């Protein structure tokens, strides 16, 4: 019912982030069902290495090991639909990781998405506000 | 006899203006004949080029997956799981979710071999191919 972005992840899991506190609200009215992806988490892990270290990073590799997020693996498939989208969606700046989750969310009937900063949006998804 | 080809040299063989573009070039046509990458690193490449370029330069990144040379290797379930319990174990040194998966691939095949940039994979106890 909820799919997840690193840039949820990534404000979720830093306090310093400027938008960790809707993210914290956020992530307390979430729906039972809560979706990400392999290529999110691999981008979560990348991007709070950078930012804030190892040790912050570890936590978001440990979202692959929970029980109540569903981290689905982007099939190659997946992966072909998301490259033949980029290709021509050339409107837009748009990234491979985003493609794949547009991908992931069409595939699975979600619209809803815990995102900010707009590519969701422009994509046909919904942001998510409190 | 392989390598393994990483993001940093994607980048500057897909972009002319990039200072090692030249070097990316020639170490191209002394490639081995054995040539592989991963869908990850395709991932990064289209980003990166889309970001500093534009779209269409990033198109030419997009194709290498259509090549019947150049071995386009689709991460397992598995092998990123190999990746994660590296990334957590190594804490001494800033490793990327892409170079561990990159990594995986080149122990699963047998690849000492990377055509890339930056060190990171020397790091890793790989050889970054030089011209």
Redesign the interface.
């Known amino acids: 019912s909820i799919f997840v972005d690193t840039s949820f992840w990534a404000a979720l899991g830093n306090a310093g982030d400027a938008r960790h506190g809707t993210a914290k609200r956020l992530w307390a009215s979430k729906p039972p069902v809560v979706m990400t992806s ?2 999110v ?3 979560t ?2 991007l709070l ?2 930012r804030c270290g ?1 040790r912050a ?2 936590a978001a ?1 440990a979202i ?1 090991l929970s029980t109540v997020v569903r981290v689905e ?1 982007v099939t ?1 498939d997946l ?2 639909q998301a ?1 033949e989208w ?2 021509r969606h ?1 409107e837009r ?5 985003d493609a ?1 989750s547009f991908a992931v969310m069409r595939k699975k009937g979600i619209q809803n998405a815990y995102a900010f900063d707009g590519d969701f949006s422009a994509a046909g998804f919904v942001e998510v506000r409190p």
């Open positions: 392999n290529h988490l691999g981008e892990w990348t290495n950078r190892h990073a570890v590799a692959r693996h190659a992966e072909e490259w980029l290709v050339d700046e748009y990234s491979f990781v794949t």
